[PDB]
């Protein structure tokens, strides 16, 4: 009925905000570019999604052999695990803020709690989606209010000139850069769209002029990604206007935002706590939906590469568990350190953006053969190659 959808994923949340607590308005440009890129990529897969009656996974299978198949399957599994780790940490932090339970108990609750999603499914969709949409929209209103006196030409002229010296030299910059990119693309979204397009009442083969569906779907996808771009830009400039030009250059993870909202002077006293807990709720809900979307993606991947299948609850459970193991390892090793956990989170995102090319290459290749093809694949070519140079340099400086 009414509009309801969740666009903020803790990955992009932390990455964008961090990018505004440390370096300022510099990263802004990168965001745009990444967003634009994803648009194009969506387009591509959707074309592949609608013709050739296959899924990107099946595609990969039809250009490989058994072993390298195992390899790319490992890679896709690792991408999914990365996203799930991001999510579970998001949920754990949300719980620790709202209630007070320590992190380990929250992590365990999250991992073996998927029964909530069968319960609430038996409960009713429209209401829950409406209410979460309301709360997210309101949280975003709050952030907008919170942004204050600012100098536009700064943001602008830093968006534009793209100080390459800057964007490449600070190897702290490449880090959050790759973070933003790999959190704006999210390969699991690629596989999932490739599959989901396969069902829109197009006359599967008996309409050579089904491309009307292509145009409609691409329009939808572009609208979606555009609004995601606006949200990311907002979060970044928020981190900027709330932590920049200061002493000790506090990192700017989640906790710091949660406090800065509370102790915020001009917001009175109680309103601090009000917005605080609202933010907490938002974090939690975003985590959960980001989980639920990717289960189908994992299923599709395994069905494609190994040509095997499992019921969903087993899939979700085992993935979540193998995801939560690194969380607990890091917690016990580093005895609990918000700084250390948020650093793990960002490293997860950047690892996602490292894995991307192994799933980007075959997409381009396959769209170079069949009946429908892009005229200027050259954009994707330059994209992947510049990409490879960046990732290998960031690897090298280690």
């Amino acid at each position: 009925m009414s509009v309801a959808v969740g666009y903020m994923d803790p990955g992009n949340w932390i990455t964008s905000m961090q990018g505004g607590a440390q370096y300022g308005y510099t990263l802004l440009f990168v965001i745009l570019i990444s967003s634009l890129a994803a648009m194009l990529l969506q387009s591509m897969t959707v074309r592949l999604g609608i013709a050739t009656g296959k899924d990107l996974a099946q595609m990969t299978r039809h250009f490989l052999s058994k072993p390298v198949a195992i390899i790319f399957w490992i890679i896709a599994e690792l991408a999914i695990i990365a996203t799930d780790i991001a999510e579970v940490i998001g949920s754990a932090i949300a719980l620790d803020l709202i209630f007070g339970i320590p992190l380990i108990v929250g992590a365990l609750i999250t991992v073996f709690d998927v029964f909530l999603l069968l319960f609430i499914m038996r409960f009713g969709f429209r209401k829950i989606e409406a209410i979460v949409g309301t709360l997210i929209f309101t949280v975003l209103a709050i952030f907008v209010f919170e942004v204050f006196i600012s100098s536009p030409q700064l943001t602008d002229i830093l968006n534009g000139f793209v100080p390459h010296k800057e964007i490449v030299t600070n190897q702290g910059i490449l880090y959050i850069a790759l973070g933003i990119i790999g959190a704006t693309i999210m390969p699991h979204n690629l596989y999932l769209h490739s599959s989901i397009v396969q069902s829109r009442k197009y006359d599967r083969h008996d309409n050579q002029e089904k491309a009307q569906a292509i145009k409609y779907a691409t329009i939808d996808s572009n609208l979606q990604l555009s609004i995601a771009f606006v949200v990311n830009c907002l979060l970044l400039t928020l981190g900027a206007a709330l932590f920049f030009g200061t002493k000790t250059n506090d990192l700017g993870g989640f906790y710091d935002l949660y406090h800065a909202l509370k102790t915020e002077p001009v917001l009175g006293a109680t309103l601090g706590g009000i917005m605080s807990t609202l933010f907490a709720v938002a974090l939690l809900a975003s985590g959960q939906n980001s989980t639920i979307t990717g289960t189908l993606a994992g299923q599709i991947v395994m069905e494609g590469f190994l040509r095997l299948s499992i019921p969903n609850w087993l899939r979700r459970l085992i993935t979540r568990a193998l995801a939560v193991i690194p969380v607990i390892i890091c917690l016990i090793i580093f005895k609990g350190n918000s700084e250390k956990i948020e650093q793990l989170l960002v490293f997860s995102q950047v690892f996602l953006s490292i894995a991307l090319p192994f799933s980007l290459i075959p997409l381009q290749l396959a769209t170079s053969n069949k009946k429908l093809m892009g005229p200027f694949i050259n954009k994707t070519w330059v994209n992947i190659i510049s990409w490879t140079l960046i990732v290998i340099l960031s690897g090298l400086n280690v």
């Epitope: 709330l242 932590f243 200061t246 002493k247 000790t248 506090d250 710091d256 406090h259 800065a260 509370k262 102790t263 915020e264 002077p265 006293a269 601090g272 350190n337 700084e339």
Partner: nanobody, 121 residues
Framework: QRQLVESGGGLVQPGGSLRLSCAAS????????AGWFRQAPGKEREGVAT???????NYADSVKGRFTISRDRARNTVYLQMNSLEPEDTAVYYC???????????????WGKGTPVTVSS
């Protein structure tokens, strides 16, 4: 120097354990650097531990093995868990801090009032 409130001291047999908790009075943004001092009744204010901005947990040279400082970045509260206590650790345990009220105001010191801790049969 007020607006900090330690709490948790109490009688304890030799070899017991307990967790003192420096705190804040109202809605404090962050605790830069803590420190727990001791002022046993016939000596000078010694000093027992020191966390830093991120983490350093530097200790004294007579306590490593029993005292585990920590922080709680969620509800700003330094902790101090003493384990396997001894009859030579009786004293009042002050707390130091480096409170910073809001995200842009400079730092500012603060001392506590401290709490007693007795160890005996």
């Amino acid at each position: 120097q007020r607006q900090l409130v330690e709490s948790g001291g109490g009688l304890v047999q030799p070899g017991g354990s307990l967790r003192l908790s420096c705190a804040a009075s109202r809605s404090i943004f962050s605790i830069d650097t803590a420190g727990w001092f001791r002022q046993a009744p016939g000596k000078e204010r010694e000093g027992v531990a020191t966390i830093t901005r991120d983490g350093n947990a530097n200790y004294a040279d007579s306590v490593k093995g029993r005292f585990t400082i920590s922080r709680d970045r969620a509800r700003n509260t330094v902790y101090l868990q003493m384990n396997s206590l001894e009859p030579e650790d009786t004293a009042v345990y002050y707390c130091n801090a480096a409170i910073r009220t809001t995200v842009r105001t400079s730092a500012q010191e603060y001392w506590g009032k401290g709490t007693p801790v007795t160890v005996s049969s």
